[PDB]
Design an enzyme around this catalytic site. Structure first.
Site, PDB file in Angstrom:
ATOM      1  CG  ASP D  20      39.165  42.145  34.024  1.00 17.42           C
ATOM      2  OD1 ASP D  20      38.059  42.637  34.373  1.00 17.42           O
ATOM      3  OD2 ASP D  20      39.818  42.619  33.058  1.00 17.42           O
ATOM      4  CE  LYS D  23      40.243  33.395  39.212  1.00 13.17           C
ATOM      5  NZ  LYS D  23      40.423  33.435  40.671  1.00 13.17           N
ATOM      6  CB  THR D  24      36.719  37.185  39.149  1.00 10.80           C
ATOM      7  OG1 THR D  24      37.197  37.830  37.968  1.00 10.80           O
ATOM      8  CG2 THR D  24      37.926  36.991  40.065  1.00 10.80           C
ATOM      9  CG  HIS D  67      47.759  33.789  38.151  1.00  8.60           C
ATOM     10  ND1 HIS D  67      47.304  33.864  36.851  1.00  8.60           N
ATOM     11  CD2 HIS D  67      46.962  34.628  38.870  1.00  8.60           C
ATOM     12  CE1 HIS D  67      46.260  34.728  36.842  1.00  8.60           C
ATOM     13  NE2 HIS D  67      46.010  35.214  38.046  1.00  8.60           N
TER      14      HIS D  67
END
Lengths: 123, 205, 71, 102, 102, 82
Positions: D20, D23-24, D67
């Site tokens: 968000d 990275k996406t 993560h």
RNA sequence: UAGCUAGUAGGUGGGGUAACGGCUCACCUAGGCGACGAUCCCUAGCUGGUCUGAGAGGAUGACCAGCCACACUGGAACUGAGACACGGUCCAGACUCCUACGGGAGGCAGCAGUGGGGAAUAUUGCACAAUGGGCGCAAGCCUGAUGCAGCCAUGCCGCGUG
RNA sequence: CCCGCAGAAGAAGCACCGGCUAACUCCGUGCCAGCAGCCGCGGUAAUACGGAGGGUGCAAGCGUUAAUCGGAAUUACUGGG
């Protein structure tokens, strides 16, 4: 017996029940097991012999002999279960198949490798 | 297929020679007959009634060099035919192709005879025949074909062939590497070694 | 052939059950069911609680002892 | 192969950092998809590979969560890819995630 | 896919799992029959779910490949299942450890 | 309806046909009224190999049965004389 | 499991079906079945056969072939020579998918194939070249029937490893 | 299916051996470990366990297990009490 009586009520064969409740026209079944004891035989012989409580996949709790020298089996372990009574112990009508599923073969066994699950020594 | 092992051990175990080696000389020195093979064969056997039947099965089977499943098929055919089963058994075994080659003396040994029929040297009525178990008929000419003709293999055999007592149911020929199978063996023609009721008895139980 | 992974250690015999079976408390271990060995039966020897015996235990089942050594 | 006659390979590129934030978004912008934040909780929770057309040129893209639990996937994605990109935001400037991709 | 070729008839060995490719999908593109030197491709008709952390390689023959896979899988189970049981030995047999065994 | 036709009972890669009177609806291997001959196309050098009782086939043609194209060819092959 | 049967058992008349018929109706009579096992429950597709057995018998009904029954669950009819229709139809139910959420779509107990079950049983193959069907005057088209190949020592049989 | 080329080259394992039942000794362990279809073996000289040598059976299979009939005149009609 009298021939009129045999016309009236005929001869009747025995039921001929099997030795194994595992049954079902099956040579092999599967189970998840729980507990591995080493129980004494009947008094004419002496030893402590390795025996396991197999919960079968068809819902039957049964008891089963462990052949060969030691084993890895414990707790929740999936083994293969063939027939065959051991008369010196109480009520055991089954044997675990060594070298199958979760079961180890017998390490450093050399003869009769058709039993005990041992691939041939190569050098 | 085939025994493949040491030939003399079978003769020594059975206690009468099975003719498996026996080319150049019928040598006593190698055979050591009736002494039995292995460590403990020196002792007297004191054999059982089951064992004398089982021994005679092996004694006959090891002559012709058959395996039990193929040998069982000859027993099933010999049984359904009218007349004595043991005689009809020995007739089918003697009727083998690899056996007739040994009888004509084209090959030195039964194993060399089976090698020559497998290696497609031998022709019967002008067909080549691979199969050793092949059942020869009355009125069957048999011969060696051109590729295998006049080699060291056949030539050494035809010399040592002369020593033999010579079969009564076939014409020998062999001036030009052929032979002719005239008629069936019968109990008188074939050897007196076999106990014929005895070998048949063992399959009854 | 046999491997020497069985363990032998002492204990006091607490109580005699049927069948020549005994409740033996080890020194380190818990109280375990111990059967008498062949040798005692062979030489016609019987034993009694309150006495201190060597008791062979297997790693496979730690609830079954074996009374090896004499009273 | 015979004589080593191998011919050019378009680069596989991996992206690490935070969903968000970007990275996406880098992958999503080339494909023009609008698939960023379409997974539950608004977050990416598993690895995927996507081949792109950069008009002109070809590139393939690999995408993985930045993560903690997805450390092994980011270890395999770094050695499988030719080029690694690390996205960073000025809210934190440095993260426990950024040194893992270094 | 690192190396740029692939067909339907190829026999594949993935870890201790083996099999022939039944069908191929490249992201949304289900019409692929070949592989580029950097593209992702779905494989289908492979036996089992492989471990997904490692190198996949095509092989010469189905009868042979199967055998190889089988043997290696057997080996894998073997070492992992052996040693372990016996080892838990002393502790399991010797002493009842602690109490808070819940 | 009734049809004269060739049914294959022979071994793999060695067809041995059985020419037979049967209804059209039934499968080739299936239910039939009667056998009438045989046809070995693989054959051997022996004289026997195509055989058909003509008093039977002319009877069934008289009852109105139709003839499969191979059997029609084999009838006009064997004739009274070949 | 010893009593069970009201369309139950029989007759007349009407209606119905290709056709006999409680087939279905109205009316009349009081029977029917039952220890040579009725009724009820459990279990089961049947047979030519296979396997075993000296035979008599016993066990068994995969493959091959004949016949019946079933086609997601439950019920019904139409069209038609023949269906109360495996890949036809209509409705209800369960369940899966699609959707603008109002409403629609689907039925591998066909051939391959996958999930799952389970001790354990295969290639998302090739061709109408052949036999045999469907349509057509015929060419021809269609035919996972069938003919064939791939895979597994699963079985039988042959041969070799001199 | 046939011919040609090369060179013993590319190709033997499996069970069992106390009696029943064909086929034996030594070593290790010591009523332990374990074998066991049946009767049973092993507590210091184990032809029955584990290993080795030798032997026997059968063959690209071998053995175990499950299933059916046989032996079983052990539901006996043929053919029992």
């Amino acid at each position: 017996a009298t021939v009129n009586q045999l016309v009236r009520k005929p001869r009747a064969r025995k039921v001929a029940k099997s030795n194994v409740p595992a049954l079902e026209a099956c040579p092999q079944k599967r189970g998840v097991c729980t507990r591995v004891y080493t129980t004494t035989p009947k008094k004419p012989n002496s030893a402590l012999r390795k025996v396991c409580r197999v919960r079968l996949t068809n819902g039957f709790e049964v008891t089963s002999y462990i052949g060969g020298e030691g084993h890895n089996l414990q707790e929740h372990s999936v083994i293969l279960i063939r027939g065959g009574r051991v008369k010196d112990l109480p009520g055991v009508r089954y044997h675990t198949v060594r070298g199958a599923l979760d079961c180890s073969g017998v390490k450093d066994r050399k003869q009769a490798r058709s039993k005990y699950g041992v691939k041939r020594p190569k050098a | 297929a085939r025994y493949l092992g040491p030939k003399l051990k079978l003769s020594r175990r059975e206690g009468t020679d099975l003719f498996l080696k026996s080319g150049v000389r019928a040598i006593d020195t190698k055979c050591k007959i009736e002494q039995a093979p292995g460590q403990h064969g020196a002792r007297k056997p004191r054999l059982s009634d089951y064992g004398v039947q089982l021994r005679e099965k092996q004694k006959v089977r090891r002559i012709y060099g058959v395996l039990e499943r193929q040998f069982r098929n000859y027993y099933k055919e010999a049984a359904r035919l009218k007349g004595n089963t043991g005689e009809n058994l020995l007739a089918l075994l003697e009727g083998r192709l690899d056996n007739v080659v040994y009888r004509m003396g084209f090959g030195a040994t039964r194993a060399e005879a089976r090698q020559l029929v497998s290696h497609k040297a031998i022709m019967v009525n002008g067909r080549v025949v691979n199969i050793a178990s092949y059942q020869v008929s009355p009125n069957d000419v048999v011969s060696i074909r051109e590729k295998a003709k006049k080699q060291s293999r056949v030539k050494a055999a035809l010399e040592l062939a002369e020593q033999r007592e010579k079969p009564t149911w076939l014409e020998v020929d062999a001036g030009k590497m052929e032979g002719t199978f005239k008629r069936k063996p019968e109990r008188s023609d074939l050897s007196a070694d076999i106990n014929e009721h005895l070998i048949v008895e063992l399959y009854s139980k | 052939a046999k491997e020497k992974d069985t363990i032998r250690t002492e204990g006091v015999v607490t109580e005699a059950l049927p069948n020549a079976t005994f409740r033996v408390k080890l020194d380190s271990g818990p109280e375990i069911l111990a059967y008498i060995s062949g040798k005692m039966r062979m030489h016609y020897i019987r034993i009694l609680p309150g006495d201190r015996v060597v008791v062979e235990i297997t790693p496979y089942d730690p609830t079954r002892g074996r009374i090896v050594y004499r009273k | 192969d015979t004589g080593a006659a191998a011919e050019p390979r378009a680069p596989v590129v991996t992206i690490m950092g935070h969903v968000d934030h970007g990275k996406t978004s880098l992958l999503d912008y080339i494909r023009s998809t609008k698939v960023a934040s379409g997974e539950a909780g608004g977050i990416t929770q598993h690895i995927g590979a996507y081949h792109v057309e950069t008009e002109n040129g070809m590139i393939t893209f690999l995408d993985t969560p930045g993560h903690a639990a997805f450390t092994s996937m980011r270890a395999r994605g770094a050695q499988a890819t030719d080029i690694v990109v690390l996205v960073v935001a000025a809210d934190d400037g440095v993260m426990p995630q950024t040194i893992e991709a270094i | 896919v690192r190396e740029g070729t692939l067909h339907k008839g190829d026999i594949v060995l993935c870890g201790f799992e083996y099999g022939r490719v039944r069908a191929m999908r490249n992201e949304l593109g289900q019409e692929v029959l070949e592989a580029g030197p950097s593209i992702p491709v779905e494989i289908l008709g492979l036996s089992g779910v492989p471990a997904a952390g490692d190198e996949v390689t095509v092989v010469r023959d189905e009868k042979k490949a199967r055998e190889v896979a089988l043997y290696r899988q057997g080996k894998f189970r073997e070492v992992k299942l052996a040693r372990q049981q016996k080892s838990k030995l002393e502790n399991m047999f010797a002493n009842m450890t602690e109490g808070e065994v819940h | 309806m009734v049809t004269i036709r060739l049914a294959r009972h022979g071994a793999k890669k060695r067809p041995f046909y059985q020419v037979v009177v049967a209804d059209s609806r039934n499968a080739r291997n299936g239910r039939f009224i009667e056998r009438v001959g045989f046809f070995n196309p693989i054959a051997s050098e022996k004289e026997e190999g195509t055989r058909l009782d003509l008093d039977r086939i002319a009877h069934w043609v008289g009852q109105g049965a139709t003839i499969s194209d191979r059997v029609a060819a084999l009838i006009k092959e064997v004739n009274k004389a070949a």
